[PDB]
Amino acid sequence: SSERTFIAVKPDGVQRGLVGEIIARFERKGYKLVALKILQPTTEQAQGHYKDLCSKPFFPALVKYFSSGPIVCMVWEGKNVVKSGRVLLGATNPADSQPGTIRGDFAVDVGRNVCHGSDSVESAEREIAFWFKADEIASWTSHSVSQIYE
């Protein structure tokens, strides 16, 4: 329940006006917003974010797109956020995603797949650590914590 995950609205998501929608679905799922900001990534911020993918053929086109406009970074906290965050976002390739998920409802191409979520806790610690200073992460208690968790 101390578990955190990192979520990003990619440039296509911000451009397309989906930021509110993505945040509302995490809110209503019962997860806690703990960090939040908007920036345009430099390409080195890009390369470092996608380290897991540096060896892939699509890596430069991805780094090029990710660094091309403002993204919104966010940190979410809760029992199982990482796994659920990924469930909420739907398959990485939209073509595989079910209606009801972010990509399922909103995306068509894996190059414009709207949003990003850490694939594991560990990646999450890394991506949280990479984008936010520890001074940037608020610490609070949801008044509904006990309506949501046992």
| Only segment of 24-32, 77-85, 110-118, 133-141 that touches ligand AMP (CB under 6 A) | 110-118
For residues 52-84, one letter each, b for 16 or more C-beta atoms within 10 angstroms of the residue's C-beta and e for the rest, the string is eeeeeeeeeebbebbbbeebbbbbbbbeebbeb
Name the phi and psi angles at 50, rounded to 5: -95, 25
- Residue 23 CB, shortest distance to ligand AMP, in Å, is 17
Is residue 62 part of the contact set for ligand AMP (CB under 6 A)? Answer: yes
Is residue 110 part of the contact set for ligand AMP (CB under 6 A)? Answer: yes
Among 7, 22, 63, 124, binds a second copy (CB under 8 A): 22
Residue 122 Ramachandran class (φ > 0 left, ψ -120 to 50 alpha, else beta): left
Is residue 37 part of the contact set for a second copy (CB under 8 A)? Answer: yes
Query: Distance between CA atoms of 133 and 128, rounded to whole angstroms?
Result: 8
Size of the site for a second copy (CB under 8 A): 67
Applying CB under 6 A, the residues found at the interface with ligand AMP are 53, 58, 61-62, 92, 110-111, 113, 116, 150
